[PDB]
Each structure stands twice: as C-alpha cells, then as structure tokens.
Symmetry: C2
Subunit: 121 residues, 2 copies
C-alpha cells in the first residue's frame, strides 16, 4: 500500500458560493459540484469543499498548499483579494511573511477557511 | 506560480496524543511536534494536526488521502483499529466500500477527524 496524495477538505455553509470563489477569483479548475460536496484543482493539486451547519467549523479550518514562486501567486491575487484581514465580511489575503521554515501567505476564503500558501527556503 | 501539493490539517484538542496515534498505530513518520501544531507523513504524503478549543471542529473535519492498494492498507490496520464505528469513545475504521468514483474506507481518529482513504476505479 502506497499513499499517493492528500486532499484538504474546506468547510462551508454554502458550498457553491465558496467553490465559485476558488474557481473564478483564485483561478482553480472545477472538478465537480454537488449541493453538499465540491472539488477544485490547480496544477493537479486538489481541494474539496464540504457543507457543515456551524460557522465555527470553517472559522477554525486550515490547509497548507506548497507552491513554487509564491511571489507570482501573491501578485496574481493582489488586485482580486483585499489585504484588509481585520475586516471579516470579505475574503482577504495577508502579505508574504518569512517564517522559520520558508515564506508564506495566508488567504481567508468567503466561507472562513484559512489556507496557507507556502514555499520552502 | 505552480502549486505543488496540498496538506490537510486535522484538528485536535490534544495534538500530541492525536499525532502519537497517526505515528504508532497508523505507521506515519513524524515530521515535527510543537504544543499546538504537529506534522506527519507516509510515502511523502503529509498531514498536519493543529489545536482547537472546541470539539465540534474535529468532529466535523475530514480529509481524503488517495492510495494505491487500499486492500493492503485496510488489512494493515484491521487488527489495530476497531470496526465499531458507532462507539464514539475510540477510533474506528469502516469496511472498504464501493462508491461511484472508486473504493474507499473511512477512519476516525482519536480526535474525531474523519479521513477517507480512497482508490480510483
């Protein structure tokens, strides 16, 4: 038995809207969408999105995506996603930060999930 | 910018205990452990484990791991993890199920996270 890859599952009270963001704003390709369960990918890296009935769940859900050329990716998204992280009514994206293992930025989606885009250095 | 891989983040009120399960029971290799944040991997596939203060979060957290030879993996774990899913006091593992996209089993860890081990067919 060999493990092949891992697929983070984001949570959302509204799967469809959250998936539309990952696709149209962030530039992921749709894999599938049902009412309760959605999937997207970019460069073969997949993320699923599953419905929940309590907002505390997505507000406490995270994922990491390892990237190459984090600078290009942040620039792609800088016009599209607010840098005002303190405003919880909209998605937002942090600046790129240097952390002890590499560089990363965080992105909070419309559902509340926090995804870390990171590069090892 | 190229995405390289995705890393699911499990939730837990007790990170250390949950990581000890993934390592000692499930046979993952430790990557790191701090009080609030842990990492493991197997065949290069990583999972992180992050602390939360509300049990509803891990009880509603999922991940998918794509595998090859799901039958070998289930057999590896069958003596080690109860098949009594209805008993919530211990980890448990479902039987392998045929789903419209392939075959899969679910594993609920001590923290409450549900991870799906799946094979495409």
């Amino acid at each position: 038995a060999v493990l092949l890859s891992g697929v983070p599952v984001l949570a959302a009270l509204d799967v469809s809207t959250t998936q539309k963001f990952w696709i149209e704003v962030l530039g992921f390709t749709e894999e599938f969408l049902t009412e309760d369960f959605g999937g997207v990918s970019r460069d073969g890296v997949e993320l699923f999105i599953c419905s929940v009935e309590d907002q505390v769940v997505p507000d406490n859900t995270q994922a990491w995506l390892r990237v190459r050329d984090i600078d290009a990716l942040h620039a792609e998204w800088s016009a599209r996603v607010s840098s005002d992280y303190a405003d919880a009514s909209h998605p937002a994206m942090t600046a790129i930060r240097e952390v002890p293992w590499g560089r990363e930025f965080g992105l909070r989606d419309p559902a509340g999930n926090l995804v870390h885009f990171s590069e090892l250095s």
